[PDB]
Amino acid sequence: GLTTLFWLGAIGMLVGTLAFAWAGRDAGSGERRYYVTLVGISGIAAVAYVVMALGVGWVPVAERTVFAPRYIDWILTTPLIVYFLGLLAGLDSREFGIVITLNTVVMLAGFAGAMVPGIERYALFGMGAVAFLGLVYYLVGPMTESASQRSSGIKSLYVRLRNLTVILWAIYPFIWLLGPPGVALLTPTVDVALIVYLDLVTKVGFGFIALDAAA
Amino acid sequence: GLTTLFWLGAIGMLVGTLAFAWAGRDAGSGERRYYVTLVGISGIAAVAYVVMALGVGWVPVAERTVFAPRYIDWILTTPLIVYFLGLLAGLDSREFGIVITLNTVVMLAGFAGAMVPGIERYALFGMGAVAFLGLVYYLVGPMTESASQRSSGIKSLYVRLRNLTVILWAIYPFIWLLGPPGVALLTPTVDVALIVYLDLVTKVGFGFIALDAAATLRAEHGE
Amino acid sequence: GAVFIFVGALTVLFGAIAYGEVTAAAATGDAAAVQEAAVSAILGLIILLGINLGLVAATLF
Amino acid sequence: GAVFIFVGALTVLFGAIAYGEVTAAAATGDAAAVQEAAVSAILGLIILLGINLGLVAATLF
Ligand SMILES: *C/C=C(C)/C=C/C=C(C)/C=C/C1=C(C)CCCC1(C)C
Ligand SMILES: *C/C=C(C)/C=C/C=C(C)/C=C/C1=C(C)CCCC1(C)C
Ligand SMILES: CCCCCCCCO[C@@H]1O[C@H](CO)[C@@H](O)[C@H](O)[C@H]1O
Ligand SMILES: CCCCCCCCO[C@@H]1O[C@H](CO)[C@@H](O)[C@H](O)[C@H]1O
């Protein structure tokens, strides 16, 4: 059941949101931004899953269904994840602009590709895939070097979140390729189930790791 | 193909056997029987797989098929693995007899259960399963204590091999229960593939771990 | 330590979801429909094993 | 490092084996045969995860 999986995603995101909200209730000036960001990451994702669970934003596109709020979710929450990582790394405005731009290209491409029939969707996929490699470069290169210049505590938390992020984000394009937007070997239910799992780990799992480290 | 999977098993075991034989060619007095044991473990397994790949020993039981050389392999090689662990742990004859006995009950039980129809096969399964728990207790309890009376290198290697053994062997009875001898939800092919993978890790992987630690053990007492 | 239980439990859950599609397809009596559901299940599980291994590698290392 | 490559690659190999049985069953036309190959494939892949995770736990901890 699609709507059931969507509901489960909503519940998971909600519990995450509340947990993060509660954890940062007494946060100082140096931690507040991080908690607020976590709340936003899981909170927006919660809205998207509820909307999909109510059957809204399901778009028919050439013998496949495209879940619009999923991509809108991605477009809005992933740069917040990058922002969180960027705060740890100690980036400035220019550097932030670079990684958010690359991230935005990834999400827009996947969305545009999902709604385009024929071989063009793979061209759009390619745009996203290349921009993603660019993003990965910054995370494991310059941003890692920038994070290294801070205290070992911050550096360790950065690396831990970086690794979770790079490893698991890299799985998304394979689901896209094998799922409905691509060769359609994965049924919509399997595609949705896998994405619910990944979303929860890359946002909620991400958050609890950060909460543990701040402790 | 079943025979293809059996050939892969045979080739894997053979490579392991030769590597273990080669590695031990210069072994000192104190190391020699460890290499010889490894050669025996993967060598017998190699024979069992070649025999099965040649289509020999495929025993029709009701409508399922039981690969006799597999269980014979098990009955003969698993006590040699236990023996290897026992040498590391430094067991005496009494302690060896206990763990070899338990191991044998496990393998006899599984073979007999595979040959029997109906509720009885689970009774035979239960015998092996309980015996296996007894064996695990010895491996993780008394034998671990025994290994702690030796050098840190030996205890280290013992723990590594013990953990590999306990974790992976525990997977075998689930494959039995879900496969042909049990409720038959795994096809023969899938059953065979999983066991080939397990057999290779528990013998050949087991052996290469021991091989990788040999130099450290040698440097530990002056060499 | 606790990641394994989590990973193991989610896998049987996803397995149950996969088996659900397969049997639903089987109830149709259409062999090709079952094939479609089956390859989806197979590829889904391969990917799932990737997520779990990736989660293990990111959390325990 | 080396283990995750080994474990990953073996997962695709077993996947190919599972897919092979599924398509072989689908070539009979019997939907029940396909379902039969599919559950074997699903359960097999789950057991494979246990082996992989077990191997990882054994040799990297
Ligand atoms: C919480 C939701 C998250 C972390 C979603 C992450 C999604 C991606 C990393 C998607 C990447 C894609 C490519 C790299 C290629 C084009 C297809 C995309 C958009 C799926
Ligand atoms: C190299 C081949 C090896 C290490 C085979 C090991 C086989 C076992 C540990 C089998 C255990 C079983 C039970 C515990 C229950 C009854 C079914 C058995 C015999 C499969
Ligand atoms: C749950 C999320 C908690 C992660 C917050 C980690 C931030 C701790 O890092 C802090 O950053 C502050 C902001 O500039 C600075 O005052 C200090 O450099 C540092 O103490
Ligand atoms: C194949 C890997 C080789 C492992 C060799 C481990 C043996 C190291 O230890 C050996 O134990 C012997 C008792 O068995 C004693 O003779 C000596 O203490 C020592 O040589």
Residue D48 to chain C, least CA–CA distance (Å): 9
Give the C-alpha separation, A15 to D39, whole Å: 34
- Of C44, C25, C42, nearest in space to C33 by CA: C25
How far is Cα A132 from Cα A99, in angstroms, rounded to an integer? 10
Q: What is the resolution of this structure in A?
A: 2.2
Report the Cα–Cα distance between both ends of chain B, in Å, rounded.
49
**Residue B217 in contact with ligand 4 by CB distance below 6 A:** yes
Structurally, at CATH architecture level, domain C1-61 sits in: Orthogonal Bundle (1.10)
Q: Which residues pair with A60 in a beta bridge?
A: A65
Interchain pair C42, D34: CB under 8 A: no
CB B120 within 8 A of CB B142: no
On the 0-12 / 13-18 / 19+ scale of CB atoms within 10 A, B104 is middle
- Chain B residue whose CA is closest to D39: B185
Domain count, chain A: 1
Amino acid identity of D31? Answer: A
Q: Which of C13, B206, B18 is nearest to A194 (CA)?
A: C13
Q: Residue B96 to residues B128, B138, B148, C61, D43: CA-CA distances in angstroms?
A: 18, 10, 17, 37, 37
Residue of D nearest to B163 (CA): D58
Residue having the nearest C-alpha atom to atom 1 of ligand 1: A199
Closest ligand 3 atom to residue A23 Cα is: 1
Q: How many Cα atoms within 13 Å fall on the side-chain side of residue B49?
A: 25
Residue B96: CB partners within 8 Å, gap ≥ 6?
B83, B86
CA pair distance A108, A74, nearest whole angstrom: 9
Range of the domain at B102: 1-223
Distance from CA of B169 to the nearest CA of D (A): 10
Q: What is the CATH number of the domain that holds B169?
A: 1.20.1070.10
Ligand 1 pocket, residue A114 CB under 6 Å: no
Chain C contact present for A198, CB below 8 A: yes
C-alpha D21/C-alpha C34 separation (Å) is 13
> Residue holding tokens 């949101």?
A17
Q: Is A203 in the pocket of ligand 1 (CB under 6 A)?
A: yes
Question: Which one-letter amino acid corresponds to residue A55?
Answer: G
Contacts of A183-186 with CB under 8 Å at 24 or more apart are A184/A64, A185/C39, A185/C40, A185/C43, A186/C40, A186/C43, A186/C44
Q: Which single residue is written with the structure tokens 């496969």?
A: B179
| Angstrom distance (rounded) from CA A149 to CA A107 | 30
What is the DSSP secondary structure assignment for residue B60, as one 8-state letter? E
- Residue B214, ligand 4, Cβ within 6 A: yes
Whether chain C has a CB inside 8 Å of the CB on A177: the answer is no
DSSP assignment of A51-106, as one string? HHHTT-SEEEETTEEEEHHHHHHHHHHHHHHHHHHHHHHT--HHHHHHHHHHHHHH
Domain ranges of chain D: 1-61
Q: Which of D3, D12, D17, D23 to mutate to test the interface with B (most CBs of B within 10 A)?
A: D17
Helix B120-140 / helix B152-169 crossing angle, nearest 10 deg: 160
